[PDB]
Symmetry: C2
Subunit: 99 residues, 2 copies
């Protein structure tokens, strides 16, 4: 699923026009990204937690020379899948049914 298709899907669920669904996706993404960039975590309960992490000084291998090099700490985004996302994908919980 590419982003346009995500938007087509969301359009039918929301009963919006496509521009609205596009705005929603882009602005969900942007809200998340700006929070994390501030060092805040974002918990979308059930789905997962987006956060910023600070990778300590560590080792990596320099592709162009093959030498191991010690690279500097780096702040990185991460997502921890929440229990319900995991439960569903692992087969331990069924997806929501019409109700």
């Amino acid at each position: 699923m590419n982003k346009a298709e995500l938007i087509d899907v969301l359009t039918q669920k929301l009963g919006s026009d496509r521009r609205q669904a596009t705005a929603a996706v882009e602005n969900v993404v942007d809200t998340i990204v700006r929070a994390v960039h501030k060092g805040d975590s974002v918990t979308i309960t059930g789905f997962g937690v987006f956060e910023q992490r600070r990778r300590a000084a560590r080792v990596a291998r320099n592709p162009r020379t093959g030498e191991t090099v010690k690279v500097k700490p780096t702040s990185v985004p991460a997502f921890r899948p929440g229990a319900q996302f995991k439960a569903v994908v692992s087969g331990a919980q069924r997806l929501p049914a019409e109700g």
Copy 2:
């Protein structure tokens, strides 16, 4: 930021009712989860890629008993942060102003 706060911010950006922003968040979530569930990946370009992976043959120590067991294989969700999401968080690229 909690989910309700994400919804409040989205309500404000979209100029919608809160109920609509709530639908937006929950149905974005459901669309992603369900695609990963059927084994497909969802690429939200810039942001990242949600995917399903198969963990096979992993060991673990049952911290109840202390004994090392092989854990039976499981399919798991994952998210790979996108190039641009990393570039903002790392400080490489500035956010749009």
